[PDB]
């Protein structure tokens, strides 16, 4: 039938960036006319594929990754980027083929007093490889003393909360991000425009 892009975009709740959700799109026709011709998107950037030509292509599978970050971190969802989100939360490959979509969600994901449901990984020993999902809550060892699972000096919880408030600046307001990855394998294609 029709690929369920509405389930991903118009979802009541989104996931934290460290626990980003992934939807597998296959065996359906994907009409992107609603997406790239919608004025409710702050960012719509495609890499290696033109958005207009998308309806004239066919791919083996499509992956729709969805999460929430702040506005200043939207640029980190791009190939070759660095930063806390790009290094420890969500990393795109250098040969990324697909589109990145992001829109402001201050009306949905923010409340007076702070929304603390959305988290991001702040500490990690090594950077994330592309499309890696790290939900570990092990205490980060910033020193030479083993932490043994108890917080303390040089032993910090890897996750932090955004604490979205509607009074925050646009750079600290919540943005919902959807990453469409079009994978190309030597297999029959099940997604077309």
């Amino acid at each position: 039938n029709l690929c369920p892009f509405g389930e991903v975009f118009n979802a009541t709740r989104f996931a934290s960036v460290y626990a980003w959700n992934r939807k597998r799109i296959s065996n359906c026709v994907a009409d992107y006319s609603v997406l790239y011709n919608s004025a409710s998107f702050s960012t719509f950037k495609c890499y290696g594929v033109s958005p207009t030509k998308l309806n004239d292509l066919c791919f083996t599978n499509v992956y729709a990754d969805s999460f929430v970050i702040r506005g200043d971190e939207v640029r980190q969802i791009a190939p070759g980027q660095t930063g806390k989100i790009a290094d420890y939360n969500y990393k795109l490959p250098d040969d990324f083929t697909g589109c990145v979509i992001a829109w402001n969600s201050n009306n949905l994901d923010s409340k007076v007093g702070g929304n603390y449901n959305y988290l991001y990984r702040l500490f990690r020993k090594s950077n994330l490889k592309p499309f890696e999902r790290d939900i570990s809550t092990e205490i980060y060892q910033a020193g030479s003393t083993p932490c043994n699972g108890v917080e303390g000096f040089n032993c910090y919880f890897p996750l932090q909360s955004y604490g979205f408030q509607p009074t925050n600046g646009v750079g600290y307001q919540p943005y919902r991000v959807v990453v469409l990855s079009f994978e190309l394998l030597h297999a029959p294609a099940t997604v077309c425009g």
Partner: antibody, heavy 129, light 113 residues
């Protein structure tokens, strides 16, 4: 209107145990973090414990860590504070407080920051022989 | 732990004149998102504390306009425009940015008539 009614206070000998209940109403209980704050006679406030909305994450003050355990029943809309191995310094008026912040299923306590929306009437516990 | 000092510990004031309460933090209260989580509480005898001001300058619902808050970083001040009879009680500043949540010593606002 949001209401927080507290119960379980009374007299207890040192080393004893008792559980306090905080019946909350007027809001989505599972959506907000709840806390227990104590105030000794003639002393200022002192945070004692707190839970996330879902109940998975708990925090305790250094004075109370290991001694007290804090729990929550979202179905009953009730907050619980189990006090064990009580000592004389624990004698205080205990309040349950709802935070203005938005916590719950995928949130963590100790990662939140803000202030208490509303406070209960407060219940007094005395520890003496 | 962030320790906060209130000044004065006792604040006598006459009816109708302004009153000022100072709260100083041992550590900067600003956070990454440029938000400062300082709160002001009023506690009447035998009653639960009620939050007058949240985030330095924002007043809670039901708080009269006589109360105002100011400050930044480590130094903050609570201002009462004209003290009324109901304003008697103990006022606390609380630190919400970092656990553990700490409180000031509390100032006793008593009125003279």
């Amino acid at each position: 209107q949001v209401q927080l009614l507290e119960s379980g206070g009374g007299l207890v000998q040192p080393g004893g145990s008792l559980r306090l209940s905080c019946a909350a109403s007027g809001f989505t209980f599972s959506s907000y973090a709840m806390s227990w704050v104590r105030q000794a006679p003639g002393k200022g406030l002192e945070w004692a414990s707190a839970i996330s909305g879902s109940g998975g994450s708990t925090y305790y003050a250094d004075s109370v860590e290991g001694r007290f355990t804090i729990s929550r029943d979202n179905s009953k809309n009730t907050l619980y504070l189990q006090m064990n191995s009580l000592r004389a310094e624990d004698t205080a008026v205990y309040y349950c407080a709802k935070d203005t912040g938005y916590c719950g299923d995928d949130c963590y306590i100790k990662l939140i920051r803000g202030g208490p929306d509303y406070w209960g009437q407060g219940t007094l516990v005395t520890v003496s022989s | 732990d962030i320790v906060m000092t209130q000044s004065p510990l006792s604040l006598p004031v006459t009816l109708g004149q302004p009153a000022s309460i100072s709260c100083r933090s041992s550590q900067s209260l600003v956070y990454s998102d440029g938000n400062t989580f300082l709160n002001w509480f009023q506690q009447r005898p035998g009653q639960s504390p009620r939050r007058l001001i949240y985030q330095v300058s924002n007043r809670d619902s039901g708080v009269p306009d006589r109360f105002s808050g100011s400050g930044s970083g480590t130094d903050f001040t609570l201002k009462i425009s004209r003290v009324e009879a109901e304003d008697v009680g103990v006022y606390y500043c609380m630190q919400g940015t970092h656990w553990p949540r700490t409180f000031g010593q509390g100032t006793k606002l008593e009125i003279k008539r």
